[PDB]
Amino acid sequence: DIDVMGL
Amino acid sequence: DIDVMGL
Amino acid sequence: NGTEGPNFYVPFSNKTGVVRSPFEAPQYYLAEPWQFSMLAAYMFLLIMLGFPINFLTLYVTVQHKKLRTPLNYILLNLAVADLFMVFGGFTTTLYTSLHGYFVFGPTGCNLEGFFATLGGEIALWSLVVLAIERYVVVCKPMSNFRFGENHAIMGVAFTWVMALACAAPPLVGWSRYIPEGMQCSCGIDYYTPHEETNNESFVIYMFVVHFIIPLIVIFFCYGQLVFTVKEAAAQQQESATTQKAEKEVTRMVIIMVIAFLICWLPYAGVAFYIFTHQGSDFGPIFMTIPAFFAKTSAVYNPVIYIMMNKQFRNCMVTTLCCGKN
Amino acid sequence: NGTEGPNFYVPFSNKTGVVRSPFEAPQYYLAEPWQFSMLAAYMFLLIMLGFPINFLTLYVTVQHKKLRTPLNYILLNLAVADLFMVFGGFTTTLYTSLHGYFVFGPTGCNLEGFFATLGGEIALWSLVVLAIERYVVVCKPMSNFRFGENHAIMGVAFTWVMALACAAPPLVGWSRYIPEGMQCSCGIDYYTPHEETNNESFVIYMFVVHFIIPLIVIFFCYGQLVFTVKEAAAQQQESATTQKAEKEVTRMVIIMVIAFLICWLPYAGVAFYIFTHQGSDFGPIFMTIPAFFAKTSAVYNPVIYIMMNKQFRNCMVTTLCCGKN
Ligand SMILES: *[C@@H]1O[C@H](CO)[C@@H](O[C@@H]2O[C@H](CO)[C@@H](O[C@@H]3O[C@H](CO)[C@@H](O)[C@H](O[C@H]4O[C@H](CO)[C@@H](O)[C@H](O)[C@@H]4O)[C@@H]3O)[C@H](O)[C@H]2NC(C)=O)[C@H](O)[C@H]1NC(C)=O
Ligand SMILES: *[C@@H]1O[C@H](CO)[C@@H](O[C@@H]2O[C@H](CO)[C@@H](O[C@@H]3O[C@H](CO)[C@@H](O)[C@H](O[C@H]4O[C@H](CO)[C@@H](O)[C@H](O)[C@@H]4O)[C@@H]3O)[C@H](O)[C@H]2NC(C)=O)[C@H](O)[C@H]1NC(C)=O
Ligand SMILES: OC[C@H]1O[C@H](O[C@H]2O[C@H](CO)[C@@H](O)[C@H](O)[C@H]2O)[C@H](O)[C@@H](O)[C@@H]1O
Ligand SMILES: OC[C@H]1O[C@H](O[C@H]2O[C@H](CO)[C@@H](O)[C@H](O)[C@H]2O)[C@H](O)[C@@H](O)[C@@H]1O
Ligand SMILES: CCCCCCCCO[C@@H]1O[C@H](CO)[C@@H](O)[C@H](O)[C@H]1O
Ligand SMILES: CCCCCCCCO[C@@H]1O[C@H](CO)[C@@H](O)[C@H](O)[C@H]1O
Ligand SMILES: CCCCCCCCO[C@@H]1O[C@H](CO)[C@@H](O)[C@H](O)[C@H]1O
Ligand SMILES: CCCCCCCCO[C@@H]1O[C@H](CO)[C@@H](O)[C@H](O)[C@H]1O
Ligand SMILES: CCCCCCCCO[C@@H]1O[C@H](CO)[C@@H](O)[C@H](O)[C@H]1O
Ligand SMILES: CCCCCCCCO[C@@H]1O[C@H](CO)[C@@H](O)[C@H](O)[C@H]1O
Ligand SMILES: *C(=O)CCCCCCCCCCCCCCC
Ligand SMILES: *C(=O)CCCCCCCCCCCCCCC
């Protein structure tokens, strides 16, 4: 999962 | 309008 | 237990000959120099946290049409009042704490005392008015009423008059402004009996008009509001929205009321205690405690009445994040 | 221009005979007492703002399963590191500023210097690792890779080793810890040439390994990331979501990178300047400026890397508001 980076 | 009290 | 002078009362005994006028020389016998530095630290924190938050509140209201409604007029008035507290009181106390006494002398004492007390009373009565206004629109106590601009403006004027009612009279003989606590900040003299200025009667008036009345009005207004909202929800249990609205309106009231108490119950608490026990002895650090609570409201009242306001909060976030979000 | 001793360098000339050891007596010739108090104020603010925010970060991670993912392990490590900075450095400097010198003496100097420098390097390298990790998952530089727990743990271990690499050696002769600036806080000696401890070579190593490498990696990793995201969005312009994601990912990178620079460019800036100009003169207040920027990251790095993280932010808000919301 890629969007969990901070946003 | 009643809910505009703060919330 | 104390040393007296023409314009002051130092809470320390001059039996060792060491006491000086808080207008003329450091008070490092009252308290260690580091404790003065820690005062200055606390002042710095209050200005560094207070000014941005309170200023920003005005700044976004210029930036966002939606914020410029009558019902916000009083929250703006709150923020201005808070700013009188930071530049009137906090910045000055920061300067003087670093000297260790009240450098600006008696005339300064009155300037500082007036504006600092003005701010605080304005903020206080703003909280009361806001609740009155909220009460009127939600509880609808009078038929055929719609709250508008010209009402909002009355509300504001009313705050400024009630604050003048408290801050002005000491300047003209009913009570007086004198350094308090560690003698770096000036406030109303509510602890020594000064027959010449009739302190006692003023302290009564203050306690009655400017504490128990506010307290009653706030409790009554929000008490009715919570009642009205609870009742409506009870009759509309099919609406989960209304149930949420009820819970959240209740939570805010508890916070507002508990916050108000934290702010003024210590001041009213010791004032009553000193009034009732006139024979007593009171340290400098003890006298600063009621103040510590009341002053920190410059930070937390905005947080409660503004940053926890969804509308103001949104506009602040967009303005802060350079637009968008 | 300066006075030398066995374990220190006071940036003031002892031509008047007034200078004392920063371990033995106040430095009020270096700076006025009020400027020491204002230091203590700034320390107080950093602890009062830093500790809650950084602690709270750990506290919610206990309270919320969702937060306990590998990719957050490094943000936790960040917060711990920040806490080493507040209790290792800030609390101590607060204590010593109020005395006006470094009361705890040389042995304390090393304790304080080690832990304060440890914290800061850990935080720093955490920022680098996070970007490496982000780069790996987003840019997918190596086939057949999935970032897991055992990788995250390496990332952390790597930070602690790289920080030890910087903080440890001064304790054992390669460079040294000595009071800096107003002599209330101890740091790496990167300004005087101490042939006995080979300061110069260490300052080089520090500059190269612990500033330009981090800087390159951060710029490369986020540079690729922004490129990858921009590219994907360009090929998927029908999706408004993806366009939003692109803009927001870009905004955060600019912030992170600009923030990183604000934190370390002044330290690297003056160190380079002092290295290049060895004949120079440097005030106490001048030497505190690089520090001022680096230390305040204990507050702002969490704000950027945690409070601006939607996930952490939500959990914080619910935890703070007694559950719900
Ligand atoms: C706390 O207590 C201390 C002591 O009780 C007190 O400080 C004292 O204040 C008096 C002023 O009322 C000082 O008296 C002065 O003493 C010097 C001697 O060194 C005199 O020269 C002064 O001037 C006089 O002499 C002239 C004769 O040529 C006269 O023209 C003139 O009128 C004066 O008589 C003056 O007498 C005294 O020195 C201090 N003592 C100390 C220890 O500082 C202090 O004011 C009290 N604090 C408070 C807040 O009330
Ligand atoms: C900044 O400069 C000042 C002055 O340059 C410097 O402070 C000086 O330090 C010396 C110590 O090196 C002090 O010297 C002492 O002086 C007293 C006289 O009052 C002596 O009693 C001391 O002890 C001696 O005497 C004994 C003989 O019976 C011997 O047994 C013993 O070995 C000593 O000789 C000693 O000499 C001097 O007093 C101060 N001066 C001042 C103004 O403080 C200071 O150290 C410099 N700062 C830094 C950080 O380097
Ligand atoms: O161009 C006017 C804009 O501001 C308005 O807000 C004002 O409304 C009152 C008009 O008499 C003033 O008393 C009040 O102080 C202002 O906030 C309006 O709200 C905006 O829509 C207009 O764009
Ligand atoms: O009962 C365990 C709960 O915590 C788990 O989180 C842990 O996951 C790893 C297990 O080896 C640990 O190394 C890590 O430190 C923990 O955060 C799990 O995430 C939860 O779902 C469990 O309820
Ligand atoms: C804002 C300034 C408040 C001072 C905070 C310190 C709390 C009180 O602390 C006490 O005060 C005594 C003198 O009053 C000292 O002698 C004691 O050592 C100290 O513990
Ligand atoms: C925020 C800026 C604060 C201004 C600095 C405070 C000025 C301190 O001024 C100090 O006052 C002392 C009184 O005890 C005197 O010894 C000296 O005039 C001076 O050292
Ligand atoms: C309220 C019951 C006791 C009345 C005595 C007045 C208490 C001191 O007065 C208070 O001083 C603070 C600092 O100057 C201000 O912030 C407050 O506005 C002011 O009311
Ligand atoms: C954190 C402590 C930093 C001090 C902030 C004040 C900025 C510098 O200010 C200057 O410093 C001089 C001495 O260095 C004083 O003599 C000057 O009066 C003062 O303006
Ligand atoms: C946050 C609490 C800070 C602890 C208070 C600082 C202790 C100050 O201690 C002071 O140090 C001076 C050195 O100049 C000496 O004159 C005295 O020992 C004392 O007044
Ligand atoms: C980076 C280019 C110059 C290297 C010299 C090291 C600069 C001083 O060292 C810095 O001291 C700060 C306070 O002690 C810490 O927060 C930093 O982690 C530490 O690197
Ligand atoms: C527009 O998007 C620019 C705003 C984004 C930058 C946010 C950085 C947060 C800074 C926090 C400051 C904390 C320091 C306070 C102590 C001096
Ligand atoms: C659960 O809902 C309880 C939390 C609600 C209370 C929020 C009050 C905000 C307090 C802000 C504190 C500012 C003071 C900092 C200076 C000392």
**Chain-centroid distance, C-alpha D306:** 15
What residues are paired with C10 via a beta bridge? C3
If phi over 0 gives left and psi between -120 and 50 gives alpha, with beta otherwise, what is residue D173? left
3-state SS of chain D is: CCEEECCEEECCCHHHCCCCCCCCCCCCCCCCHHHHHHHHHHHHHHHHHHHHHHHHHHHHHHHCHHHCCHHHHHHHHHHHHHHHHHHHHHHHHHHHHCCCCCCCHHHHHHHHHHHHHHHHHHHHHHHHHHHHHHHHHHHCCCCCCCCCHHHHHHHHHHHHHHHHHHHCHHHHCCCCEEEECCCCEEEECCCCCCHHHCHHHHHHHHHHHHHHHHHHHHHHHHHHHHHHHHHHHHCCCCCHHHHHHHHHHHHHHHHHHHHHHHHHHHHHHHHHHHHHCCCCCCCHHHHHHHHHHHHCHHHHHHHHHHHCCHHHHHHHHHHHCCCCC
Ligand 10 atom at shortest distance from the alpha carbon of D186: 14
**Chain-centroid distance, C-alpha D180:** 17
Ligand nearest to the CA of C263: 7
Question: Hey, CA dihedral for D43, D48, D51, D53, is it positive or negative?
Answer: negative
Of A2, A4, A7, nearest to D248 by CB-CB distance is A7
Give the residue from chain B lying closest to C147, CA to CA.
B1
Which three-class secondary structure state does DSSP give residue C210? helix
- C305 DSSP assignment: I
Give the residue from chain B lying closest to C256, CA to CA.
B6
- Cα separation, D105 vs D108, whole angstroms: 5
Q: Is C68 in the pocket of ligand 3 (CB under 6 A)?
A: yes
Are D95 and D123 in contact, with CB atoms under 8 Å apart?
Answer: no
- Cα separation, C224 vs C249, whole angstroms: 12
User: Which whole-number Å values give the CA distances from D172 to C225, C288, D58, D149, D232, in the listed order?
Assistant: 69, 48, 33, 35, 51
**Atom 5, ligand 7: which residue's CA is nearest?**
C190
Are C67 and C315 in contact, with CB atoms under 8 Å apart?
Answer: yes
Chain C residues closer than 8 Å to B3 by CB: 245
Q: Are strands D8-10 and D185-188 parallel, antiparallel or unpaired?
A: unpaired
How far away is chain B from the Cα of C6, in angstroms, using its nearest Cα?
49
Q: Is C140 in the pocket of ligand 3 (CB under 6 A)?
A: no
User: Which whole-number Å values give the CA distances from D300 to D49, D255, D265, D308, in the listed order?
Assistant: 10, 11, 16, 10
Which three-class secondary structure state does DSSP give residue C194? coil
Which ranges of C64-198 does DSSP label H, i.e. alpha helix? 70-83, 91-97, 105-139, 149-167
**Atom 1, ligand 11: which residue's CA is nearest?**
C321
Ligand nearest to the CA of C212: 7
Of D71, D248, D305, nearest to A4 by CB-CB distance is D71
Ligand nearest to the CA of C37: 5
Neighbours, chain B (3 or more CB pairs < 8 A):
C
List the one residue out of C250, C259, C258 whose CA is nearest residue C223: C250
Which three-class secondary structure state does DSSP give residue C177? strand
Structure tokens at D50: 């830093």
Neighbours, chain C (3 or more CB pairs < 8 A):
B, D
CA of D97 to the centre of ligand 9 (A): 9
Buried b (16+ CB within 10 A) or exposed e, C178-196: bbbbbbbbbbbbbbbebee
Ligand nearest to the CA of D283: 8
- Cα separation, D256 vs D276, whole angstroms: 29
Inspect the interface and report whether the beta carbons of D44 and C48 lie closer than 8 Å: no
Are D177 and D189 in contact, with CB atoms under 8 Å apart?
Answer: yes
Which three-class secondary structure state does DSSP give residue C48? helix
**Under CATH, which number does the domain C1-325 receive?**
1.20.1070.10
Angle at C39 between CA C180 and CA C113, to 5 degrees: 35
User: Which whole-number Å values give the CA distances from D2 to C22, C95, D36, D181, D206, in the listed order?
Assistant: 39, 31, 20, 12, 25
Are C156 and C190 in contact, with CB atoms under 8 Å apart?
Answer: no
Task: Please state how this structure was obtained.
Answer: X-ray
Which ranges of chain C does DSSP label H, i.e. alpha helix? 33-63, 70-83, 91-97, 105-139, 149-167, 199-207, 213-234, 240-276, 284-295, 297-302, 310-320
**Atom 7, ligand 6: which residue's CA is nearest?**
C99
Residue-level length of chain D: 325
D296 and chain A in contact, CB less than 8 A = no
Residue type, D266: P
Are D30 and D12 in contact, with CB atoms under 8 Å apart?
Answer: yes
Give the residue from chain C lying closest to D304, CA to CA.
C321
Chain D residues closer than 8 Å to A5 by CB: 71, 134, 137-138, 249
Q: Is C255 in the pocket of ligand 12 (CB under 6 A)?
A: yes
Resolution (angstroms) equals 2.8
Q: List Cβ neighbours of C218 (8 Å cut-off, separation of 6 or more).
A: C127, C128, C131, C256, C257, C260
Inspect the interface and report whether the beta carbons of B3 and C245 lie closer than 8 Å: yes
**Atom 8, ligand 6: which residue's CA is nearest?**
C99
Residue appearing with tokens 């930036």: C63
- Cα separation, C194 vs D103, whole angstroms: 46
- Cα separation, D261 vs D12, whole angstroms: 31
- Cα separation, D159 vs D195, whole angstroms: 29
Q: Is D17 in the pocket of ligand 2 (CB under 6 A)?
A: yes
- Cα separation, D236 vs D33, whole angstroms: 62
List the one residue out of D314, D319, D294, D312 whose CA is nearest residue D82: D294
Structure tokens at C97: 């704490």
Q: Is D277 in the pocket of ligand 4 (CB under 6 A)?
A: no
- Cα separation, C249 vs C239, whole angstroms: 16
Q: List Cβ neighbours of C318 (8 Å cut-off, separation of 6 or more).
A: C324, C325
- Cα separation, D173 vs D277, whole angstroms: 24
Q: Is C272 in the pocket of ligand 12 (CB under 6 A)?
A: no
- Cα separation, C21 vs D203, whole angstroms: 54
Q: List Cβ neighbours of D281 (8 Å cut-off, separation of 6 or more).
A: D1, D2, D11
Q: Is D255 exposed, middle or buried (0-12, 13-18, 19+ CB in 10 A)?
A: middle
Ligand 8 atom at shortest distance from the alpha carbon of D42: 1
Chain C residues closer than 8 Å to D245 by CB: none
Are D112 and D89 in contact, with CB atoms under 8 Å apart?
Answer: yes
Query: Which of C46, C297, C304 has the most ligand 12 atoms within 8 A of CB, as the residue to mutate?
Result: C304
Q: List Cβ neighbours of D16 (8 Å cut-off, separation of 6 or more).
A: none
- Cα separation, D8 vs C319, whole angstroms: 47
Chain D residues closer than 8 Å to A3 by CB: 245
Q: Is C86 in the pocket of ligand 7 (CB under 6 A)?
A: no
Q: Is C47 exposed, middle or buried (0-12, 13-18, 19+ CB in 10 A)?
A: buried
Structure tokens at C132: 């009155």
CA of C100 to the centre of ligand 6 (A): 8
- Cα separation, D5 vs D106, whole angstroms: 12
Mutation site, C64, C147, C309, interface B, largest B CB count within 10 A: C309
- Cα separation, D120 vs D126, whole angstroms: 10
- Residue D76 sits at φ, ψ, to 5 deg, of -70, -45
User: Which whole-number Å values give the CA distances from D239 to C94, C325, D229, D230, in the listed order?
Assistant: 55, 18, 13, 13
Domain ranges of chain C: 1-325
D33 and chain C in contact, CB less than 8 A = yes
User: Which whole-number Å values give the CA distances from C38 to C26, D49, D73, D103, D309, in the listed order?
Assistant: 16, 16, 36, 18, 34
Angle at D37 between CA C119 and CA D286, to 5 degrees: 115
Residue type, C64: H
- Cα separation, D222 vs D226, whole angstroms: 6
- Cα separation, C114 vs C164, whole angstroms: 9
- Cα separation, C297 vs C85, whole angstroms: 10
D274 and chain A in contact, CB less than 8 A = no
Query: Which of D117, D185, D216, D297 has the most ligand 10 atoms within 8 A of CB, as the residue to mutate?
Result: D117
Residue type, D47: I
Which three-class secondary structure state does DSSP give residue C185? strand
User: Which whole-number Å values give the CA distances from C19 to C7, C25, C176, in the listed order?
Assistant: 15, 9, 22
Are D46 and D295 in contact, with CB atoms under 8 Å apart?
Answer: yes
Buried b (16+ CB within 10 A) or exposed e, C25-35: eebeebbebbb
3-state SS of D19-57 is: CCCCCCCCCCCCCCHHHHHHHHHHHHHHHHHHHHHHHHH
Which three-class secondary structure state does DSSP give residue C119? helix
CA of C66 to the centre of ligand 3 (A): 10
- Cα separation, C310 vs C291, whole angstroms: 30
Element (H, E) at C8: strand C8-10
List the one residue out of D94, D41, D60, D29 whose CA is nearest residue D283: D29
How many other CB atoms sit within 10 Å of the CB of residue C19? Answer: 20
Angle at C106 between CA C98 and CA C192, to 5 degrees: 95
The gap between the terminal CA atoms of chain A, to the nearest Å, is 12
User: Which whole-number Å values give the CA distances from D4 to C172, D11, D178, D201, in the listed order?
Assistant: 60, 9, 11, 21
Q: Which residues of C are annotated as a binding site for Zn(2+)?
A: 200, 278
How many other CB atoms sit within 10 Å of the CB of residue D254? Answer: 11
